[PDB]
């Protein structure tokens, strides 16, 4: 099924030919090594060039961050490795590493080791704690060693790709390769490891225009990806998403599904040939290097697919697997605020679609999983499929038996007891739908609220909402935008009176239907009502609640957390992070 | 005055490695040398004078054999030479030879090369001899109407320094620069004209600002900084004007330029002691400390928060 | 060092009569800073200018 990845451009950096890209683990930085002998550091949040290192007049083919030492390590065609402090811009060290061009640098994640590969057919291991001594030389390639990658699951192993048409897997401490993979008809330019624990896969790209996926335990080719029109210059597994990213001298980046091996998307930004790809663990940002510059793309939503029922059952998706945790199973353990909860996780099975969103219905009996342009409604206890269909968006009504789906930008369908009740076309189209007491429909002109039963327009609001949160009483509604949020009071009695008398009904609905209680200049990421208190997480990683025009901070969060729910019995608010760590606050 | 008490615009500590050229050698190279030899001889003469050597015998040699040259490098080196050479007798009278140099300045102010005019105008900002400036005043005024912004911006600075030091030579300078500021389009020329009015005639600077006050957010950062400096000086001298400018300074806290934000926050604290104004300025400083990556900025802006706390 | 002995002829500050917004006129710190940087600031305390 086609993975609907929302692909957003975060950075566009025009420069000379980019030969390597890397992402900083903690800072919003992209490293780009240029063909003109300069290395640039871009901030992808501010879209600014932060740092520039003039390395040499010759191409810099490899550059890597060493975040733990505040270093940038560069390998240039002058056969020199240069180490720079990225804070002081000072050159810490410089040495001749190889007798020919340096093609790739791999930094060991925990040990003081750098692996370098060269056109001299050698791979060398350097120990920086031993004054950059060469600790080992790996011999056995018969042509240029284009790329090296350390195994993320076993840091003592690395793979090398060579123009000799071979892939060799090496072990630190062995002068001989553990094995050689053969099967490319031309030189191999790129290699990467699958990061997930479930599969022993390698990916390689070659001048034969093929991308091959290998099982490194069985030493077999699992799959061949065909479709690039020129040499494949880069191939990688995404660390978080079930996708493969391949780049080619054809100027295209292709995104493939990592389990079905189908082409999902083809990106062409008009920057000529693609040379390099970098991804970061725990991030959906992907850096792409081209002949005319570099681009950062954000792939999909950063929000984890997770939902909590009113009883404290949490369901989340870990890739395609659905897992359940139960807060009631913790027993009398002293829970501290902001600490990770020790939850017993139960595997519920794999979903047929890639879950982008998971939501319980208001009574917790059913769970909807939305992904790949489909929705599947499961029973919350046993994940039995109860209903399925095609939808772009899904929204539950306040009534646990009703839901709406957005089938297209012009058609909204309302379902009751899993049967289609009504289909209507909103006057200005439907760009998004929101559930709750009223059916919210976002259009290009603003927000319209409709009655779930009659599909009558209650009120139009000139605002572009991102989220709409209703109170359990149905009297209060939060409309969150990209810049601010508004608290509105819904005057249900005035709406009923206006529907009976037809007084005050206009083309924009009932004028008296909503009263504005407040406007707050904070960005809501996630929100929940508890009585007349609106609890939310801000863009600045604060946990706040709004009550009576006052904002009260509950806690300062050290990372982006997502609101799951509030359990009144436990006096605790539950939050989840991107890593599916659940925390609670009193 | 001794060379140590004199105004020093230039210091050059070159090790005189080679035998210090004799005054006779320098004189021969200046008289008979090619343009390169004359250029090197003139550089050596400038360095020797800067290091405290008195070469009065070379003055007329430079006037006769170097001053009439049209070489751009020699023209610029001559401006540095005229900056440092003694122009007066010990009794404070102008040297008779300087009359010949005054005609050369007039020719350079009328030169077809705009950079020679601009460099000569910049040199005239350092001249302290009123008798040399008086015959140049018509040529300096004509440079305000020059087609190149490079000439106009330096002509404003020359008029400002002449007015400041010798008001009697150009008593209409504040009016002339106000009319220039209203008609000017170049941002650097506008800044230099506005800067002159801040120091020479604050009321005319305020009148100009009052016509543009609603547009200040759309101005370039350089002009915004000089406007913030005027608002500070005016509100310091006349506390009743604070009420007029608070709204303008608060809008400048939202400037795209971090330099303008910093100066606007510092000025806002001087305009208002109200808790809301101090909170807005303090938040602007905190936001600058968090967003700015440079530790120099972080430390200095932290010291502004410490100064705020002392109240 | 800040507790100057109040003299009989010193002004009586009536806080009830002072408007709450009278910022003390600080000296122009920019002009003082410029004079200090040029070395033209006579140090206030030590060189009695009438010495």
């Amino acid at each position: 099924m086609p993975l609907r990845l929302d692909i957003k451009r975060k950075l566009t950096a025009r420069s000379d030919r980019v030969k390597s890209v890397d992402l900083h683990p903690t800072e919003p930085w992209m490293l780009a090594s240029l063909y003109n002998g300069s290395v640039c550091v871009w901030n992808h949040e501010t879209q600014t060039l932060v740092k520039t290192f003039e390395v040499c007049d010759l191409p810099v083919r490899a550059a890597k961050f060493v975040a733990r030492k505040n270093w940038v390590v560069t390998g240039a065609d002058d056969m020199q490795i240069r180490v720079f402090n990225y804070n002081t811009l000072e050159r810490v060290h410089m040495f001749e590493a190889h007798s020919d061009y340096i093609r790739c640098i791999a930094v060991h994640p925990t040990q003081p080791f750098i692996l370098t590969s060269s056109d001299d057919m050698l791979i060398k291991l350097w120990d920086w704690d031993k004054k950059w001594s060469c600790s080992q030389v790996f011999e056995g390639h018969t042509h240029y060693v284009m790329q090296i990658v350390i195994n993320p699951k076993d840091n003592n192993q690395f793979a090398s790709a060579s123009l000799d048409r071979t892939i060799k897997v090496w072990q630190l401490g062995s002068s001989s390769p553990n094995f050689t993979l053969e099967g490319h008809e031309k030189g191999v330019n790129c290699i990467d490891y699958y990061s997930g624990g479930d599969k022993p896969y390698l990916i390689s790209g070659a001048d034969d225009r093929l991308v091959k996926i290998w099982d490194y335990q069985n030493k077999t080719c699992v799959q061949t990806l065909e479709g690039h029109a020129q040499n494949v210059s880069c191939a990688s597994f995404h660390p978080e998403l079930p996708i493969i990213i391949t780049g080619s001298e054809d100027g295209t980046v292709r995104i493939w599904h990592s389990s079905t091996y189908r082409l999902e998307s083809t990106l062409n930004y008009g920057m000529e040939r693609v040379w390099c790809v970098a991804s970061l663990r725990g991030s959906n940002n992907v850096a792409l290097g081209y002949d005319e510059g570099s681009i950062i793309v954000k792939l999909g939503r950063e929000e984890p697919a997770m939902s909590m029922d009113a009883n404290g059952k949490i369901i989340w998706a870990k890739h395609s697997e659905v897992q359940q945790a139960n807060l009631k199973a913790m027993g009398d353990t002293e829970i501290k605020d902001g600490e990770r909860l020790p939850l017993a996780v139960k595997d519920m099975g794999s979903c047929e679609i890639y879950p982008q969103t998971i939501q319980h219905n208001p009574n917790g009996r059913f769970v909807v999983v939305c992904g790949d342009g489909e929705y599947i409604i499961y029973t919350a206890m046993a994940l039995r499929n109860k209903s399925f269909g095609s939808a772009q968006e899904f929204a539950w009504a306040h009534d646990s038996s009703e839901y709406a789906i957005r089938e297209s930008n012009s058609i909204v369908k309302i379902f009751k007891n899993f049967k289609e009740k009504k289909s209507f076309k909103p006057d200005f189209g439907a760009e998004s739908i929101y559930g709750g007491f009223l059916l919210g429909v976002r259009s290009v002109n603003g927000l319209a609220f409709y009655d779930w039963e009659n599909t009558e327009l209650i009120r139009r609001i000139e605002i572009q909402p991102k989220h709409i949160f209703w109170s359990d009483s149905g009297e209060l509604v939060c409309i969150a935008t990209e810049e601010s949020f508004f608290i509105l009071k819904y005057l249900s009695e005035k709406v009923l009176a206006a529907q009976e008398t037809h007084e005050g009904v206009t083309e924009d609905g009932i004028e008296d239907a909503f009263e504005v209680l407040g406007e707050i200049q904070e960005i809501v990421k996630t929100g929940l009502w508890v009585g007349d208190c609106f609890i939310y997480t801000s863009s600045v990683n604060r946990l706040n609640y709004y009550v009576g025009g006052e904002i009260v901070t509950i806690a300062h969060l050290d990372r982006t957390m997502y609101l799951l729910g509030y359990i009144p019995k436990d006096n605790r608010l539950y939050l989840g992070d991107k890593e599916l760590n659940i925390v609670s606050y009193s | 005055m001794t060379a140590a008490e004199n105004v020093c615009y230039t210091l050059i500590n070159v090790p005189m490695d080679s035998e210090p050229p004799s005054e006779i050698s320098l004189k021969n190279d200046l008289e008979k040398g090619d343009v390169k030899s004359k250029t090197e001889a003139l550089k050596k003469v400038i360095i020797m004078i800067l290091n405290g050597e008195k070469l009065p015998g070379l003055l007329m040699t430079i006037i006769r054999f170097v001053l009439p040259l049209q070489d751009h490098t020699i023209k610029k080196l001559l401006l540095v030479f005229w900056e440092i050479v003694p122009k007066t007798t010990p009794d404070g009278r102008l040297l008779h030879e300087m009359i010949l140099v005054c005609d050369a300045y007039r020719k350079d102010l009328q030169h077809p090369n705009e950079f020679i005019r601009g460099s000569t105008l910049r040199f005239l900002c350092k001249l302290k001899e009123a008798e040399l400036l008086e015959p140049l005043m018509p040529a300096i005024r004509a440079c305000l109407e020059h087609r190149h912004s490079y000439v106009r911006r330096n002509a404003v600075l020359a008029i400002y320094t002449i007015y400041r030091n010798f008001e009697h030579l150009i008593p209409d300078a504040p009016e002339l620069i106000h009319d220039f500021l209203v008609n000017e389009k170049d941002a650097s020329c506008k800044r230099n004209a506005f800067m002159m009015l801040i120091h020479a005639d604050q009321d005319r600077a305020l009148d100009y600002l009052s016509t543009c006050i609603d547009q200040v957010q759309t101005f370039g950062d350089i002009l915004q900084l000089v406007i913030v400096e005027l608002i500070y000086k005016v509100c310091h001298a006349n506390p009743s004007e604070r009420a007029r400018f608070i709204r303008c300074i608060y809008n400048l806290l939202q400037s795209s330029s971090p330099a303008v934000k910093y100066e606007a926050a510092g000025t806002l604290v001087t305009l208002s002691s109200a808790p809301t104004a101090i909170k807005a300025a303090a938040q602007c400083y905190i936001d600058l400390i968090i967003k700015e990556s440079d530790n120099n900025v972080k430390l200095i802006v932290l010291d502004r928060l410490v100064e705020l706390k002392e109240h | 060092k800040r507790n100057v002995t109040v003299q009989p002829d010193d002004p009586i500050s009536f806080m009830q009569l002072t408007a709450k917004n009278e910022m003390n006129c600080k000296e122009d710190q920019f002009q003082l800073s410029l004079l200090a940087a040029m070395g033209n600031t006579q140090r206030k305390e030590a060189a009695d200018p009438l010495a």
């Binding site: 002109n445 603003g446 139009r460 609001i461 000139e462 605002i463 601010s484 508004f486 206009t506 083309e507 924009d508 406007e519 200049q521 | 009420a243 608070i246 709204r247 608060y250 809008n251 208002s272 002691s273 109200a274 808790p275 809301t276 104004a277 807005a280 | 709450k20 917004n21």
Partner: peptide, 24 residues
């Protein structure tokens, strides 16, 4: 006749109204 949310300059007006409430 759509409900207009957000007027440009309201933040400056709110700051000025706060300063006036503080006696400036």
């Amino acid at each position: 006749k759509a409900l207009k949310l957000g007027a440009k300059g309201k933040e400056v007006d709110n700051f000025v109204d706060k300063l006036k409430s503080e006696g400036e």
